[PDB]
Amino acid sequence: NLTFKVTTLPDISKFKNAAFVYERIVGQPLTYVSEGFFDGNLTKITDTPFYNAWTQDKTFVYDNVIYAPFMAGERHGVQNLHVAWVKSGDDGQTWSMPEWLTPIHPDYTADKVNYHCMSMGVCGNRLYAVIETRYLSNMRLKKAELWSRPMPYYRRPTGGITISSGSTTATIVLKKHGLKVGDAVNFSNSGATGVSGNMTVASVINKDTFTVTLARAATSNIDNTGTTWHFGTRFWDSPWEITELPDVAYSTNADLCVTETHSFTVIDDDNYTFAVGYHNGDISPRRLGILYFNNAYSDPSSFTRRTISQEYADNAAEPCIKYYDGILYLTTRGTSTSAAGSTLAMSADLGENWNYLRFPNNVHHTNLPFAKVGDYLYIFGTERSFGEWEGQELDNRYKGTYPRTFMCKINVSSWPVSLSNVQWFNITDQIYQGHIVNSACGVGSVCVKDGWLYYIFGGEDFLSPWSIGDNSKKLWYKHDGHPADLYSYRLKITEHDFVSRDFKYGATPNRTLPVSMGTDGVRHVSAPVTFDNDVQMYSLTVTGLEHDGTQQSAVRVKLDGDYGVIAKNIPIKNPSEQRLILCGGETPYTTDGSLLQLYGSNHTYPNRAILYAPGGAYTQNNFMPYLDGQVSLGGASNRWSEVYASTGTINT
Amino acid sequence: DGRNLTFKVTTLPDISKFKNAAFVYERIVGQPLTYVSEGFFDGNLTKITDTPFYNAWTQDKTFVYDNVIYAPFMAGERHGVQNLHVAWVKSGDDGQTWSMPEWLTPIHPDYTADKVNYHCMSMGVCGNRLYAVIETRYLSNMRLKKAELWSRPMPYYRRPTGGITISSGSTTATIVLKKHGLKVGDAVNFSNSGATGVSGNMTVASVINKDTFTVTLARAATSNIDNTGTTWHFGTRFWDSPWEITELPDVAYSTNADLCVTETHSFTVIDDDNYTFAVGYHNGDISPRRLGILYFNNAYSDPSSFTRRTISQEYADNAAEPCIKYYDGILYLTTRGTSTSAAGSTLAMSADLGENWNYLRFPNNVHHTNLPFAKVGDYLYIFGTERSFGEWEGQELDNRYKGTYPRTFMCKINVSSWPVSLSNVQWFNITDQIYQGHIVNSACGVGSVCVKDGWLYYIFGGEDFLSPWSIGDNSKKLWYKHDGHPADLYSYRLKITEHDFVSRDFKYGATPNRTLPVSMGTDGVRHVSAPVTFDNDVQMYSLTVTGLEHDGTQQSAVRVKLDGDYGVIAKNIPIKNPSEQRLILCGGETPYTTDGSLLQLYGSNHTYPNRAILYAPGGAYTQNNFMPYLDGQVSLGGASNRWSEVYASTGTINT
């Protein structure tokens, strides 16, 4: 590669392996790369009409799978919002459908709050997340809870299962299991009678040992020494451990206030020591630092606030934090174009004391997620709209623009003397749509899997949400919905001593609603599906016919609600026909079955009802007029032929 | 590495073994064409629709507006207007990815009664309004019954300062908004106006001038209002605005060759502020042909007023489907040639809005394709596609009824001065498409060109080798049978200026989630987050109707509604045990009386055919008079089904 300084940007697309240093704003050089300069490329990873944004700062890799958690909503607020993730099982080439991790808050309507999250990661084989409850009205933090589950994982251990005759307690040795009482697990081929299939953790003895309860007592002494068996957690069946974090909430007291929790890093995996970033950007003087948890497994409510110096917390927010080899690294977001901005900091004593390096030129509006690879920090940020990156530049909103994403690479083999000469590289450009002031661009997160690093972050497209227009309600299903979606910049960070794993995708996408063309020539959908909105269809047959050909005897339509309504719309063609016909046979004719016809108010004879039952109409129970002494049985032109009763005297 | 140089070869080499090279080759003696390797042009092809409809004919409707690229086309089933919608797909990312089709016209309201439907090859934007010539054509023979100019305000956003005034006691608010393009009745939206009563969704009440309109307040102002100094937000509501629809006199088939119109095609603006524009047209039905433009001097104030301006007969003979574009006082035009054995496509220009033309015939009888183009700097970039392989060259015969790889071509004509001749025109084969082969018709080409910033787009048709089986089991041309129709759209995106920015490109690795947006819920089930209408028969294993919305609000009333003149809920003949056939309606959760009252209607196949039985442990009641339908014929009880006792206010039966 080669880098040189230009007075004007050249035709960048013509070149390879080149980068151009250019001062768009005088005195603020940035470097613009051509293709081939870095071995990195951008992939779009969500494409839904929700406002999908804010991976900050939650990405992680676990058991070969890359997780990109984010929030799927409709605006910069918690209206209709789920904390969610998408995942990649192919090193970031393709990404799954969004999965909601939080439900809509149970008190959404009553208390006008909903969930939110910017801090999530894995520690000691458990997922941890700071799930915040925020007000719909003003986005203030009402309270915050640490949520945890055992991660989804698989083990193939040998031995370690013992049960005494007469006991219902089975003891299971499983190193660093990370389980808690009540967690859901599964066993196969255990070689220990009664320890099989789906079970629940009954007790935890130590880091490597737990118990489960058998349905019935063992009738011999059991020890599966020598037997190789299979174990899996059941993440989706395990109750979340939910622990309120005291004083983590909005407050008008500057020393209590928390604006956001953000970022997560493990200090000691086996002892559940980790840190969560936080700041107060609501009440001066600001505070920014970490919440340090000495042992989140045994004491999930116990943490201490460890802050950075005031002059680096001023005009700052949203620390990204990562621990490596005894050193905790931190970057901040600057909150003003006209004040000193983002800072890089490190601590060798778990946040009690820091060394600081300010980035020059008031880096602002972006968090700066990063990873350490070898001797370098790879640090990324994205401006919200074109031309806002440079210090002192004004916001550029309300028109469509191409915001720049930047990366720098800082050698920390020893702590740098200064970042005055930092070289930011513009590595990709995104789109800011422009018809609302808010931008989803950036607000990202960095993770690493083997020889690839991922900066996973937001960008938009030029299709308007029409908030100003016919969609002030921000309905995602109207027109093009919201243009905020996620992208992944995947950068090579080590030698790739293997032949390519890459592929082009040429398949029919078939996970969201899996369709196969049947031998009947019709599309079959092979998953249960719930439609959250109004559905119309040309005709409906309810089949009771499953995949393997089993035909149910009872075919069912069920209605929820306080009451169910099956009704007949006013006809468009011939309103005088209006009626609902319920049929015991295949067609609405008495040769095929009994029928009940309920006529509507538009019918020629409005609101009549007629029962047709050639085989006889029967009532199992007493049959009466609703009101006493008012309703006739038969009529003057509709006399029953004869009345049959056990007594021939009418009771008056 | 050919260093962007060109070679003349006796036979085509292994083109995939080179970059930045082009090869001049005469497949047909005397008719050289140039074949490019990767890299010769900074251009690439993207497939932009993938639906089982017959999706074809962007000609000549594409446009770019407020950063979005629009590719209008027709989605139907054949070369005809059966089942067809005028539609578009759009790109919000410079042509990398494209939206679901949106239908712009409904099926014609008189489709069945009058046997006609809509059609469009002319659409564009003038003065912040969408304009289209929406044709009504006969299903039987495709003849043009009538044509209408349709317009709406474009979807757009503004952020103005000041300009809203209201006098005390008035219900009229006056809105200054430059070049608004609105008409009375158009739908708009306001936010943060700083003017009481001017807020949310409103309708244009009157238009005062090009820069000023009014809206009507729900109640009279109680003071003089002027939002001077206030910055506010404005948006049109395109989809809520009525179309203005204007019949175009004599734009229809006619046996009079001076009236007859075969097709309207292409659109270009001459003056945006004064709504002056032209639409291409030709008569290819009645000799002598006519070809030229419909010129509208002011389509805003007088949408029905236009004049015909034709090219000369010499160049109208054997021609059709003019593409027209206006730049800096000059109207440029290309034609489609209609015969392999007569002089073909012509390039022309007019400095007087079509009253006179300067002509340049392309050599070698270019035919069967329209030639859409754009001017960029001193050059016209002109594109065309053969319908099937080997048809491009003059005098070549049609090559249908087998699968082939038709070539797409581009030429680049320097018009800094008008050329002396096109005899030396260099056509570059820039991409190859597929013609499927099992029907004579081809959707290849029939395209359109538009430009956004440093990219030009040729958006056009191609097929694939999957048969529609029109000869086979699908002569009805049902799109949902087998693979439907192979016609879909493609976009060739070509760099046409310096790109002084880092790449905006990305690879698409997302789960596509716009057509039926699905998320996996915390319940472990797929949730679909949009209303959906199924236009065909649906079957399902079981159904629960929930009344449960996204935010968790649960409706008290859960509803199943049936349209039609009458609604039928019926029980098919059982496959396993026909003698059980019955429908059970239940007031509780299961069909047992411990859970609720039940009505069972037995079918004709039941062991006890055609019985009805009502189960109501809490009592069965009728609010109204309850009678036999026939008089004197129906029994109440029976000899072995006696009521225990009868209770009535009078003990005398009325005979």
Next chain:
Amino acid sequence: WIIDGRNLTFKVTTLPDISKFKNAAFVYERIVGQPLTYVSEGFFDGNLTKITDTPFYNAWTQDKTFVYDNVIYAPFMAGERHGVQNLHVAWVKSGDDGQTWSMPEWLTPIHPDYTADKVNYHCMSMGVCGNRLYAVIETRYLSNMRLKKAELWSRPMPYYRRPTGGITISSGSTTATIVLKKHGLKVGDAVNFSNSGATGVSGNMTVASVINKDTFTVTLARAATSNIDNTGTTWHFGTRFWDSPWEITELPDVAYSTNADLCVTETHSFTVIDDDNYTFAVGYHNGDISPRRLGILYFNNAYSDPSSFTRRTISQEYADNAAEPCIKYYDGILYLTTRGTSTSAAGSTLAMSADLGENWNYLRFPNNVHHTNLPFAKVGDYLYIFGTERSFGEWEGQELDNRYKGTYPRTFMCKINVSSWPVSLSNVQWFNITDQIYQGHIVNSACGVGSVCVKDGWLYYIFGGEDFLSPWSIGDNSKKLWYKHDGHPADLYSYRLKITEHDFVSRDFKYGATPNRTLPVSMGTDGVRHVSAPVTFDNDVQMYSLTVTGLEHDGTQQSAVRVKLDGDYGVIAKNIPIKNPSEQRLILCGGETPYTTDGSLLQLYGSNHTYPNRAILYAPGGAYTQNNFMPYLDGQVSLGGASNRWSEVYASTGTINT
């Protein structure tokens, strides 16, 4: 890239940074004594595409791929595990030279006796002969995967012709004779005609008789009234593949047996020897009973005699520890490769026969190639042969299986000159051309088990790979439900390799469309998504509300709108309310809303209602019964009650019948 290797090969001590090279290859001994070659981008003009993406366990193209009338077919099985539970034989297809691939189409239904007999279908041998599709459709036990029986299934291929002349009818006859060369049709096959120029020969018809290879008849709806001969008329013909019954023929003794000479473990691979005479071969082996047998089933004329075949085996030396032959016939020579079944015994062998499988010449691959079939095609003088290890590091001879953790198994290709048949394969050069993923949470791997086909200047190795998303069989999904979580990670890939000069401008495109074939959606002028195909949901559906419209695409509105229920009986029921259980009831309405001002109503109250289990009929226009109306029990049910007296009773006779 930094270094242009200029298509040269380096011998290296350890693999370098391969992604920094183009046009380069590296010979490396991961295992000492077993060199393999690793390629950078550009070394071969070949690239990988993912071609299925569904949550089923989609695997085993082996060895069924083929190209017909410009379309590439990739048949496979869509199921849930290494077994036939819930499984369909299926295919996906490409109409654009392998760039994009269709939704799966099920070719076999679930076996009609799946529940009663506990068996289901399976297939590893399929192809085209004489314009018909042929497949050996196996019936296997769910419990142990043994082969119960096997059937030869065939249909005419979907095809189109544009002939001239050839249709004759005698006056007075209802038989039309159709000349169509090598039609491949059988009696009962479904066809379609257009523009025949022969009265009565039009539209959808059925084959009535077959006269010879080039001639068949159809029956007219009425007798011709003149002598008809459409000589000089150009017309149109299509088969109707999907409307033609399958010809299904049992293959005697192709089944599990404890007799080593009858036992068939699998039928596998297909190749045509003579298209016009319907001579073809199907591979097979017995790997269940020692001594093993491996070879071909040779069908001399499958059209006239689909049940007639002979077994032709390779020598015991090369059948031992072997399975799953891939077989291909070219220019009078039949080539065969085997799968090796042990890492610690001599493995895959390449063989050729000049006499249709009676005698073979053999070449053992060195180093115990095992666990993979080796599909191939011949291009010029060379066989291009492909295989994939099941998990990383299993390829080399003697290496142990490496399961139960996620890994990146290697795919390999070699190129063997068979015009000059080698003396030995000792110096075979295997190239690692792409790497797949083995997910790791179950022992079984879908990687490989592939098939090779060719279209013009491109060769396709179409085969399996996984991804790292677990199926949770150990976890909450031991039932292997595809619709739970991410379903199964097994899906198909196509490695498309340039094999001739490409003397044309690129046909390639990037895909940037909204995928819209599975459930075709358009945004309507009503601002709602419309789905433009019939759809059947095989699982439970919930929806917020439902309107049944009777309104079709062209705007035609049905007078009768229909909801129908299958089953023995249909149930429409009211669940227990979550908000206010005391309201529980179902309201059936003749008008649009549940109020008597809009229509008659029948209200059925639930057991949780304030007044449990009542039924009330509201009929302001009068309630009528056409038929006799009676209590179900005799002498037990009252008509009216003490506080619910009818005003007056009207009957033709005033005496109650007791």
